[PDB]
Each structure stands twice: as structure tokens, then as C-alpha cells.
Amino acid sequence: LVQKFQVYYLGNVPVAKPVGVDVINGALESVLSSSSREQWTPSHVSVAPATLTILHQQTEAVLGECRVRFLSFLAVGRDVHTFAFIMAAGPASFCCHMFWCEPNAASLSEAVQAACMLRYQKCLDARS
Amino acid sequence: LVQKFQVYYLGNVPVAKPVGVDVINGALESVLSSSSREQWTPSHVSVAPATLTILHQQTEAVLGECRVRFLSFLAVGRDVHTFAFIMAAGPASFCCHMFWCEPNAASLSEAVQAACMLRYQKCLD
């Protein structure tokens, strides 16, 4: 059920806004300008209904865990390999998680979108 | 008896059915994307046994008032912040009022749930 994607985890940075392609592009270029593919942490991203887990490539040790309910934005970068999403870690705290994917990041972004679309809503019939 | 909340009032739209998450999701998408974070009216919601009252946060001007007896459906959206309910607005008409809540819509969803319980208990007499 849960599917895992082989990625380079580029880390997470604080950002100024919860939404925007401008924000995730600037965040990615912060990582790409001072570190190469060799410095990035190879791992897996498991897209579960409630959580995204950044999880090591064979050992299965957790690098980070993000609840889908706090996800505020996601986008593939101007580079088709790069992918990022922003977590609303509170009222003014925003965090941007970044990834590099081979062959590209389209499959991983769609899995995170499906995770954000098929949510359980709380429902109540109040009729007589 | 009351519970009061600081939320954004996204307005109300006519809807096709008295119940439905399909009905409520389409209502929220109509307002979440055709309205911006600044043209959302900051509001004060007063939840009472008989009435839900929606007031402008400062001026306390009336943005809307809904009687609990006509509530037919309640729902939190796919977004945990959003909350909406459907009203019996006419003979065959239906209306959906929508809200955005911080940190989330749980406390507001409970208070409106408590109001419907008082009505459901009032009718069981």
C-alpha cells in the first residue's frame, strides 16, 4: 500500500511564506549552490495516508517525519529532478523539505498529491 | 449558553443537496480559489443552542445568522482549517456557509455539533 521512492534528501530549511513556487525555488538554489550530489543523503520517502517519512535506503532509520495535515504547498522545481514541499510548522513557522529524484520527480510529486487529495473528512448528518 | 470563536468567514453559497462532502468540497473550492487571504472577513462566531451568529470581528456587524434547527450537514474539509455546514434555506433550496479556523476547525466543529445535539434532544420530547 505505502510506496517508497529512492531519493536524495537535500535537507530542510525555514522559509518566509507557506506557499509559492518562488519560495521553493529559492530554497532549492540555496542547497544547489553550496553542495553537490555527493553531499546529499540517499534515502527513501514513504508516502503514507497521514505521514511522509524520510527513511534510510536500506537500514530503515528515520531522518524525518511530516504529517500531511500540515503540508501547505508542493512543487517540482525548474529542474525536473528536484522536488519540494512546505510544512506549516505552526502559526509563523514554515519548513521546506527538498529532494532530488532519478529519473525525475514527477512520480513522487503525484504520490504526495494523491496523499493530499484523498483525506478523511469528518462528516455529520444533522437532519431530523 | 455559548462558545465563541475567532475565525475567517468565507461566505455562503447555494448548494444542490442538503447533505454531501461532494457538495461541501465543491462549495469550498468555489470560495478558497476565487477569494484571497485579505478579502476574507475576520469574524466572531457565537454558537448558541438556537442560533449561530456570525459577526465582523471588530465592528460586530452582522455578516450572517443561522438557526440550528435548519442545520442538515456538518463537515471539516480536506483542509483541517476549513469548516462548512448546509442550511435549509427554502422549500427546496439549500445554502452552505464556510469558515477558516486557526489552529484548526476542531473546536468550532464540536460547538456546532453540540448545538445540533440540543435540538435533536429537544425534538425527542
CATH code, A107 = 2.30.29.30
A116 near B CB under 8 A: yes
Residue A24: phi, psi to the nearest 5? Answer: -70, -30
Identify all chain A residues contacting B25, using CB atoms and an 8 Å cutoff. 121
What is the least distance, in Å, from the CA of B71 to any CA of chain A? 6
Contact check, Cβ <8 Å, A121/B77: yes
Grid coordinates representing B59 are 465592528
Q: What angle do CA B18, B65, B15 make, to 5 degrees?
A: 25
Distance CA A10, CA B108 (A): 39
**Which of A119, A125, A126 lies at the smallest CB-CB distance from B78?**
A119
What is the sign of the dihedral through the CA atoms of B121, B70, B4 and A125? positive
CB A66 within 8 A of CB A52: yes
Give me the torsion for CA of A51, A52, A56, A62, rounded to 10°.
-40
Instruction: Give the residue carrying C-alpha cell 469558515.
Output: B99
Give the max Cα distance, chain A: 64
CB A106 within 8 A of CB A75: no
Number of domains in chain A: 1
* B49 contacts: CB under 8 Å, gap ≥ 6: B1, B68, B115, B118, B119
Distance CA A114, CA B113 (A): 30
Q: How many CA atoms lie within 13 A of A48 on its CB side?
A: 11
Q: What angle do CA B98, B99, B101 make, to 5 degrees?
A: 160
β-partners of residue A67 are A51
Contact check, Cβ <8 Å, B102/A122: no
In terms of residue numbers, what domain contains B33? 1-125
Residue A26: phi, psi to the nearest 5? Answer: -65, -35
CA-closest candidate to residue A5, choices A49, A50, A42:
A42
In terms of CA atoms, which chain B residue is nearest residue A123?
Answer: B75
Expt. technique: X-ray
Distance CA B42, CA B99 (A): 10
Task: Give resolution in angstroms.
Answer: 2.6
